[PDB]
Write a protein that binds this ligand. Sequence first.
Ligand SMILES: Nc1ccccc1N1CCN(CCO)CC1
Ligand SMILES: [Cl-]
Ligand SMILES: [Cl-]
Ligand SMILES: [Cl-]
Ligand SMILES: [Cl-]
Ligand SMILES: [Mg+2]
Length: 346
Amino acid sequence: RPTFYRQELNKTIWEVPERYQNLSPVGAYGSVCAAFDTKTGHRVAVKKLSRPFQSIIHAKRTYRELRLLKHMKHENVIGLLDVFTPARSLEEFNDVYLVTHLMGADLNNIVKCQKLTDDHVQFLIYQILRGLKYIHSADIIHRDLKPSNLAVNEDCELKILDFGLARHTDDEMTGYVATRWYRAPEIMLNWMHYNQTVDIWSVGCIMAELLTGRTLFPGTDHIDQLKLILRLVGTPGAELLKKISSESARNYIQSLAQMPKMNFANVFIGANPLAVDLLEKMLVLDSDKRITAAQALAHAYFAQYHDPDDEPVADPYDQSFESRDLLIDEWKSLTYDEVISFVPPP
Ligand SMILES: Nc1ccccc1N1CCN(CCO)CC1
Ligand SMILES: [Cl-]
Ligand SMILES: [Cl-]
Ligand SMILES: [Cl-]
Ligand SMILES: [Cl-]
Ligand SMILES: [Mg+2]
């Protein structure tokens, strides 16, 4: 067990191992500090969870986040560098700290500020799809892909972060907000049980924005956004209507006048024809018919970068805990076991 030291920073007590030095606050579910890790030479983010075990819902969310971060081991996905608690036993266990690489710029900064060549778009979207092939192979759905959840460094290398770990609130998704502009219509409107195909819809929205410099579907509310979507991809046919489970949602769709799919070459003027082709295969209304991550990596748009011997899949991921009903102290004990069994990366 390492030696810990205490200090108060912006009204919060931080108790951390001596290896972490020069803590500096940098910003819902916890507080974050930047620090220098003297054992590895890494510049890191240290997150202290806020009230991790205050309710059954919150204790299960703490366990879910720690299990997910411990599993992710891929070049294009955020990984876990360390996890610690100052507690010396389960009986005094109350605080959880998570350590990751400190991230600088996100894709928001790049799209708004830089001039991107087609080669930049190829490399950035290739890396998102490479990470998604890995994530989806473990039957994990990210659910919240958007530019602020994609970190990028000076060499245009990219990492996926901030997995969807709790339900977003109704208020967070209301109005003219980027939190909703990248969501697939079937989850935005609760049409049906969703699956991993929702993440490919988000990649299409991000790729369009890199090519034009503008948000693809900037709706002022749920219904305005749906109208923008259906004007581009067309209104649904009877085949997809069969798959919408809410009678009321089906009724609303049929109240709209029918519209054909638009010509994407006349929307994304001057783009690489291979980029136009890939966008038509991602932005498909019926989720059963969208291209998958593994299929998209083999598309000719990525011929410069595709290497099927360097696109790995994940170890199996057991999510059976998600249907388990436990007491707070039982979720807490499961979390404690995962903290003390952590083994750092090479
Ligand atoms: N590779 C990478 C890709 C996208 C965004 C950021 C980074 N690095 C991670 C490594 N770190 C240095 C050691 O703490 C600098 C940022
Ligand atoms: Cl230490
Ligand atoms: Cl990482
Ligand atoms: Cl503690
Ligand atoms: Cl964003
Ligand atoms: Mg985020």
